C-alpha cells in the first residue's frame, strides 16, 4: 500500500472508523474507494475528497503522502507557540550533550569582548550578507536595529552532522527551507487551548500579554499547520515540556517520515 500523515484530528455514531491525531502516520491498505480508505496507524479513514467536501460544507488540510528515509544527521528542532523560549532554554540546559545552538551570521560590528565564530560569524560588508541571502545561503534572516542577522544552512548542518539537535529560534517559514536543504527539522507547535490555558502554562505574564500570545498562536496555526511535525497541549508548562521531549524522541532516530512524491 502506501503511507500518509494526518494533518488534522479525527455525532455518537459507531463504526469501524479509525481515530487519529495530527501527525499520525497511517498505513493505507486499500484506497480503491473514493470515500473511505482502509488503514492502520503505524479501520477506515475519510478520503481526501471526503474530508474536503465536509470541510467546505461545514464552512483544506487532510493528509499528505510520506515515505520513510534514513538520515545520518540529528534533526534540527523548531519549537513554536507560547512558552517556546522556556522550552528551548530548558532543553539546552537539560541535555548539553544532545542539544546545541548554531552560530548565526551578522553584519553588526563585533564588540571588543566577542569572538568571531563563537558569538556570531561577523560579516565584513552588508553587501556580502545580502548577496549570500539572495543566493539562498540562509534558512532564515532578518534585520534588527539596522544590521542583518541570519541562520545559515551551513551553520545548522555543522551542528546536525555533529550528531546534535540544533535548537532553532526561527519562524515556521524555515521548515520548508530546511527540508529543501536535506536537514529535516522536528517542528513542534505548542497550541494554547484557550486564553485561560495560556495563563496556566505561564503564570508570569499579564492577561494582556496572554491575549496577544493567544492571537499569535491562532494566526500561526492558521498559516503553518502543514509544516508542524507535531502539536502539543497541556494544563501546565511541565506537561508541555514532557510532551515536547516525547515528540523529539519519537521523531529522532535514523529512520524518519518525510514528504513523498506520490500525490493523493
Ligand atoms: N529569534 C532569534 N533572535 C535572535 C537571534 N540572535 C539574535 N537575536 C535577537 O537579536 C537581538 C540582538 O542581539 P545582539 O545584536 O545583541 O547579538 C536579541 O535580543 C534577540 O532578540 C537568533 O538566533 N534567533
Swiss-Prot record:
SH3 domain sequence ranges: 1-55
GO BP terms in the entry: AMPA glutamate receptor clustering; cell-cell adhesion; cellular response to potassium ion; cerebral cortex development; chemical synaptic transmission; dendritic spine morphogenesis; dendritic spine organization; establishment of protein localization
GO molecular function: acetylcholine receptor binding; beta-1 adrenergic receptor binding; beta-2 adrenergic receptor binding; D1 dopamine receptor binding; frizzled binding; glutamate receptor binding; ionotropic glutamate receptor binding; kinase binding
Guanylate kinase-like domain location: 74-249
Similarity comment: family membership: Belongs to the MAGUK family.
Domain notes: The PDZ domain 3 mediates interaction with ADR1B.
Function (record text): Postsynaptic scaffolding protein that plays a critical role in synaptogenesis and synaptic plasticity by providing a platform for the postsynaptic clustering of crucial synaptic proteins. Interacts with the cytoplasmic tail of NMDA receptor subunits and shaker-type potassium channels. Required for synaptic plasticity associated with NMDA receptor signaling. Overexpression or depletion of DLG4 changes the ratio of excitatory to inhibitory synapses in hippocampal neurons. May reduce the amplitude of ASIC3 acid-evoked currents by retaining the channel intracellularly.
Name under which the protein is recorded: Disks large homolog 4
Species this protein is from: Rattus norvegicus (Rat)
Covered range of the whole protein: 430 to 724 of 724
Amino acid at each position: 500500500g502506501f503511507y500518509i500523515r494526518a494533518l488534522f484530528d479525527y455525532c455518537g455514531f459507531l463504526s469501524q472508523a479509525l481515530s487519529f491525531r495530527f501527525g499520525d502516520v497511517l498505513h493505507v491498505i486499500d484506497a480503491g474507494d473514493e470515500e473511505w480508505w482502509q488503514a492502520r496507524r503505524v479501520g477506515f479513514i475519510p478520503s481526501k475528497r471526503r474530508v474536503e467536501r465536509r470541510e467546505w460544507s461545514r464552512l483544506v488540510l487532510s493528509y499528505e503522502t510520506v515515505t520513510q528515509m534514513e538520515v545520518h544527521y540529528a534533526r534540527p528542532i523548531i519549537i513554536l507557540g507560547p512558552t517556546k523560549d522556556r522550552a528551548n532554554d530548558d532543553l539546552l540546559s537539560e541535555f548539553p550533550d544532545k542539544f546545541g545552538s548554531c552560530v548565526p551570521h551578522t553584519t553588526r560590528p563585533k564588540r571588543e569582548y566577542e569572538i568571531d565564530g563563537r558569538d556570531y560569524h561577523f560579516v565584513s560588508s552588508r553587501e556580502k550578507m545580502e548577496k549570500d541571502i539572495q543566493a539562498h545561503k540562509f534558512i532564515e534572516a532578518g534585520q534588527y536595529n539596522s544590521h542583518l542577522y541570519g541562520t545559515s544552512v551551513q551553520s545548522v548542518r555543522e551542528v546536525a552532522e555533529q550528531g546534535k539537535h540544533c535548537i532553532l529560534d526561527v519562524s515556521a517559514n524555515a521548515v520548508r527551507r530546511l527540508q529543501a536543504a536535506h536537514l529535516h527539522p522536528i517542528a513542534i507547535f505548542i497550541r494554547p487551548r484557550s486564553l485561560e490555558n495560556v495563563l496556566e502554562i505561564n503564570k508570569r505574564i499579564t492577561e494582556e500579554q496572554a491575549r496577544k500570545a493567544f492571537d499569535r498562536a491562532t494566526k500561526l496555526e492558521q498559516e503553518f499547520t502543514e509544516c508542524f511535525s507535531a502539536i502539543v497541549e497541556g494544563d501546565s508548562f511541565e506537561e508541555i515540556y514532557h510532551k515536547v521531549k516525547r515528540v523529539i524522541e519519537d521523531l529522532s532516530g535514523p529512520y524518519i517520515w518525510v514528504p513523498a512524491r506520490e500525490r493523493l
